[model samples]
Target: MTKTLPKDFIFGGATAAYQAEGATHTDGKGPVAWDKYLEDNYWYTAEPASDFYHKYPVDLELAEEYGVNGIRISIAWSRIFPTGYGEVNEKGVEFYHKLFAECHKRHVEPFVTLHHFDTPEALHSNGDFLNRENIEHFIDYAAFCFEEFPEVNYWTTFNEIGPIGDGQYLVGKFPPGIKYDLAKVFQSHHNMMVSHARAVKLYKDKGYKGEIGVVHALPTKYPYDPENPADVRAAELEDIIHNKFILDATYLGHYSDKTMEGVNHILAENGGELDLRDEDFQALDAAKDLNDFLGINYYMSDWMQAFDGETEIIHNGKGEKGSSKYQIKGVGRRVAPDYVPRTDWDWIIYPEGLYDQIMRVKNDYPNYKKIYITENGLGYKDEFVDNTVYDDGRIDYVKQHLEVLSDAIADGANVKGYFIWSLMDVFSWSNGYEKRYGLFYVDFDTQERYPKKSAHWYKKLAETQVIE
Candidate 1:
């Protein structure tokens, strides 16, 4: 029997700073890697993005029209401390206070993320988290946010944080884009884990009245051949790397032996070794019980098998929408069969993966209190006819996922809320505005927003709190 959604279940939308906020150089704001990346790269541009920095009110109005009761947005570190840390930017602090207050005014809750792929240029100049000393700076920044924004009750320490290392060091897709530097990748992950733990502890020690946790992109990774032992083993390893490696140390209190084994093996393969220091473990141990919930951003699942290439692994190219890609020697891939639908971007439309992922967390981390679908949405090329956008594909995509998400909760998965990937189509990191995922259609030229068909559909769902 499917359980009814609790009355308090929050339905919301999400957007990030660099992707949504375009006043990158205004209000004494300092630059981050993203600013530099957009300047140097030619494939996509993020400048003057939706201008959510100044246009959040209009966007939030659309969120309200869609019956959204919650919103997930990031607070730019550089905005507050333009040079990482020094004198506070009163204007920056004032801006967020006003923005969060507006959400409250409109009866919408705000789930604030501290870091969302943008670090203050001041810190990035000094190697960001890759430098061990910067961990303390991050802790200080977290503390500052807590002190400044007392109204915010839900906090996410990082948003899809794994890519900080994976994109730069392993895949060479994101900023500081270097590839196959295992030592740098491993070190960055270790430092970030410790920093997250320490910040959670700081939030508590500061006597702040809020729940804090991390948001992760944990796509359900499936074995290409379930009947093949080798394939199953290979998939298990991928699962450990993609999910368990970070979740265990942060929420479960310690890294699992399997995770450590994989990390050690990968480090050695790259001529590196486990470099976590004693302090890092102490920080993690302090945070074992600090996690308030697990926030998951599920997009799609992947099929993996053993790789047989010269390179240790082959990764899918950046911005290549879809899960049909390969990686980590011994991990194979597959395109979704005819039975499964895919978006224009080639991403498999596997709604069941949401239920499986939530249940997987329930079974794996028995201690978790709740789960939030922090980001789940469909991105497609829009068709505008007569000034209105019709996005039935996105409507069905969300409806299917919501049904499965509800089923998982009915089966005792303890999900509390769901936030769609965006409120309005903003600048996608790799694809830029080419890929659109929003309830409201934003005309980039005039900055006008119009509700899409999905917005109406979602409004009905949100108002009723029923998938049907």
Candidate 2:
């Protein structure tokens, strides 16, 4: 079996602007929905995080030195347009132009996401994407970036559209903490899909010089007992909600009837209706073929079992294992078998899931031209010693996934690149800084970057195009 990636495959690192750039109040940059909630909820604030806003060159240089050829970054919508729209922040604009130039200077390719869950406060307060008006604002911001930053040849519409609904409405992890609102969950997903479709259409129509696509966090779903029909149905329901719904919108330009059946089942069981219209489908249809690639952000897979209990969600963000409790009325509850290993936060460590998801997309959505493993890494607690981290677990985790990626590529999946979850330690959305997912161990106090053992392992992988 081949253990190597294609010669042109890109080995990269990923970071979101809001998480890495900790200038919450600098240079005309506006606030996001996370601003107050973070201060009100957590013991930490978003300032001085990696401090990438002031110290990006060092990080980029480390990336170059470590053989990383591509970098995944998100333009904080709040930075470019403080109120989401109506005014442009020149300083904020200047920051990104310089940032992009530095990436080019280091010979690192930039795959930039326009939105990475930080909706500007003004728009987020007025129903972020639930309001159709907000979608227009998003499109306006995307179009502005397309015209403004010509240096970025790779553009992504949104980071993970599936999880905004999952984190905010279902898990109560994101802002406003609305729990178990099924209507809002599905509505939010649809609105974001519309925003992406329209943005892609506008980009192609205006002859923008870049490839545009959407990233979906697809952790493969499986039945706890494959022989049991009820368990199979439960896994199917969760899969429809998380992976299939948005994928159909992206590639087919409409939700498949099979997907809608499960969607309708959940809506009927949970009490909600999706406000979909033909015009929205028209936009999806217009841009479905324009998507240059699909970015699959795989972290872990899930196993689902039959459950009819009331909706309960306990997000384990504090590195506490077995503290997670998720049960849905109609869908299913999460299950972790003794057969598979898991992370401290109860994430299943199944690299086979990555290969399964890649093959599934290749077979199901032929419209997708190519694929990128946008963000895949283990969130580990590293032991810092002598200005370095000996994180062997992280090295094994990435090697396992990369092995499957190579197998998938050998079997004819058009995957072009693989980027680890993060470049350096940043503020995790829900877990604060407790959950670390970076190749470089970041001293949040000193704002210094130390290469974890996995970083050295990755340097070899990037150099040899082989999984060692």
Candidate 3:
């Protein structure tokens, strides 16, 4: 028996500028920190990766043929505001117009993201989100986007806001590569939320016709042993730092008393302090309920056990199973229990987390108007055979998650949409071009695209509205 997805549910594909669109230095597009950062750290660059900047027409046509109805694309902040604030690049502005027009021509709706981990080198060098001045620049860039690109009905102010600071400070995989900085981690998240709030306020104040929201990478955290108090406390503390604080800021307008208690405890244990201003709270309060929707990127969940040991973390870049480790001083340590299945990259494959997240938001944040699975896909080293990629693993990944999504919808959650992470194979960050998460595989050498089995499956799923 096949389960039918909700009617009018948005079935889309997601792509970021730096990851998918490979024209790093093309058409007056300014350099982002990733350009130099990747060069210094990794082996490959982002240019000529997917070549989506040039081959967008082909991808959109593929979307039309595949029955994919929506496309998640992001505007490179540096592409418009070259030096972060001063000059406007007309060429950059014109390029997006063409892209969105092409999307509509193919009858595909464009869900646009203003920032997706790529920060302009100019603003980033001045402290990314640490400095208060950069927040001002972000609002200006955001305002310009709202006024200029009215054709886009759906707008995400920032994609996966929680990870920007986590990647830059905690994991240290992203640029500036500073690890073990707990204070900077909290500060970065707060500042980005402030910037997001200001943008939401501006969009409404200006009477923009389109809907606006922000995306958060909200991974559910569970205790290793439900019976142990220490394990339960550990999971709660980690969730407060990673998910609760961000959600409170977004929907509650301020941190709840319980959230602050957990936050202060972590800061004291980790030797960190958070700075808050009265004006920042005011901005957050104003935009808390104004969001038209909330975008969630759910990939992995954490199983935490109590740990008072030194803070240690490791990221699995290559496709090596069981190479990842994460633990915080006051918070809990992440463990991959033997019962749970994992990916080659050591990410725990838990479809239940997706359903839990949707329910959590609905029960916790009543102000949340709608929910979108903004990014969800499997990252696999697909084998290209005979002009196509036969990836049943990717198909299985999407099918399992889609089944859970259907369950969430049936459980009275207002889950509105789902977007697979990449439409085509793009240069993945940190791991370079190795880990591919695309329905359509891209041949890096010839700039060609080949559909995997999942792409064909998606076509049938979208057309039939059945989870087959």
Provide the overall lDDT of each model, using Cα atoms, as 2-decimal numbers: 0.81, 0.90, 0.90
Q: Write the per-residue lDDT of candidate 3 for residues 1-468, one digit (tens) a residue.
A: 878898798999989998988888988999899999889998999888898888999999998899889999999999998899899999999999999999999999999999988889988988998999999999999999999998999999888777877888888999999897878988988999999999999999999888999889989999999999999999999888789999999999999998999988988988887889999999999999999999899899989999988999999887788888899998889988888888889888999999998999999998898998999998978889987888888898899999999998899888889999888899888887989999898889998888888899999999888998
- Per-residue lDDT value at 291 in model 3: 96
Q: How does model 2 score by TM-score?
A: 0.99
Candidate 2 lDDT, tens digit per residue, 392-448? Answer: 898888999999998898888999999998989997888878788898888988998
Cα RMSDs of all predictions? 2.2, 1.0, 0.9
- The TM-scores of all predictions, comma-separated, are 0.94, 0.99, 0.99
Which residue window of length 10 is worst by lDDT in model 1? 310-319
- Candidate 2 residue 422 C-alpha distance from true site, Å: 0.9
Model 3 misplaced stretches (Cα beyond 4 Å):
none
Tens-place lDDT per residue, model 1, 299-390, is 98867676655344334334354533445543333435556776655677788988888888888888778899999998877887667788
